[PDB]
Structure formats: structure tokens, C-alpha cells
Amino acid sequence: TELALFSRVNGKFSTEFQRMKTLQVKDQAVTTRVQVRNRIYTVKTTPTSE
Amino acid sequence: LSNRTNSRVQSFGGVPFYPGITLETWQKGITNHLVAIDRAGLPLHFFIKP
Ligand SMILES: *[C@@H]1O[C@H](CO)[C@@H](O)[C@H](O)[C@H]1NC(C)=O
């Protein structure tokens, strides 16, 4: 606001407001699964075992 | 984001498969590890002959 009276009385009134706002959200979800199965031999009993 | 990786191996005879192996080393590695894969047979009563 600027006001001038009689070309001699001057008045300035300058008001500024400034608002910054920042939000950040980060989510991670890692699921890992490993499943190993070796079946190497098969051991069977002889028919004629004592 | 969404990553979804599913692997699945199945070996039959040959080196115990582990993820970091190459197909060349698996083929070269059946030098001693072999498994029957197809079989032909006869009914058992046919072997009881004079
Ligand atoms: C995993 O997600 C990333 C995202 O940066 C993507 O570039 C990639 O292709 C996805 N898959 C693998 C196997 O990395």
C-alpha cells in the first residue's frame, strides 16, 4: 500500500508472507525366497536281508 | 513400482544345480552323474522258463 498526501506526506506499507511445505514418503518392501532340494540317491533294502 | 521374479530349475542327473552355474559347465559335468531317463522292460513271468 502506498499513500501520498499533498505531494509531501508519503506512506509505504508492504507485507509479504511465504509458506513452503514439503512432504515425502518412501516405502520399500523386498520379499525373497529360495528353496533348494537335492535328492541324490535312493537307498533301498535288499529283499534277502537278515 | 513392482518387480516379481520367479525362477524354477529342475535337474535330473548331473551336477547339483546352483543358480550361478552355466549350461556349458552343466553339460561338461555329467561325466559321472547319470540317471536313467527311459526304460523298456518285460513282464516278470516271462523270465521263468526252463
Ligand atoms: C526391477 O525394477 C527395476 C526398477 O528400477 C527395473 O528397472 C527392472 O527391470 C526390474 N526387474 C529386474 C529384474 O531388475
Side-chain angles (χ1 to χ4, degrees):
Chain A
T1 299
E2 303 180 2
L3 179 57
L5 297 179
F6 299 89
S7 180
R8 299 180 303 180
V9 179
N10 299 20
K12 318 330 168 292
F13 178 78
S14 302
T15 61
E16 302 81 332
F17 318 99
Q18 175 178 350
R19 308 179 141 130
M20 292 76 98
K21 185 182 183 181
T22 300
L23 279 73
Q24 302 187 6
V25 180
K26 162 147 179 324
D27 179 327
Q28 293 197 358
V30 172
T31 294
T32 303
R33 170 175 175 86
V34 175
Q35 165 176 348
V36 179
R37 162 168 282 246
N38 302 277
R39 180 155 80 107
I40 295 191
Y41 287 102
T42 297
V43 197
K44 288 176 167 289
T45 192
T46 306
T48 65
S49 183
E50 286 283 43
Chain B
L1 177 56
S2 176
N3 283 22
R4 296 179 62 259
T5 82
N6 162 334
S7 304
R8 169 166 56 180
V9 185
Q10 275 159 28
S11 184
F12 287 83
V15 185
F17 196 95
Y18 51 90
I21 208 187
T22 55
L23 206 63
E24 170 254 2
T25 311
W26 193 87
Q27 293 284 89
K28 290 186 173 178
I30 66 183
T31 306
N32 192 19
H33 321 71
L34 274 182
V35 53
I37 73 182
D38 249 17
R39 43 181 63 96
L42 297 172
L44 164 71
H45 62 253
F46 160 106
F47 306 82
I48 315 315
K49 330 279 252 176

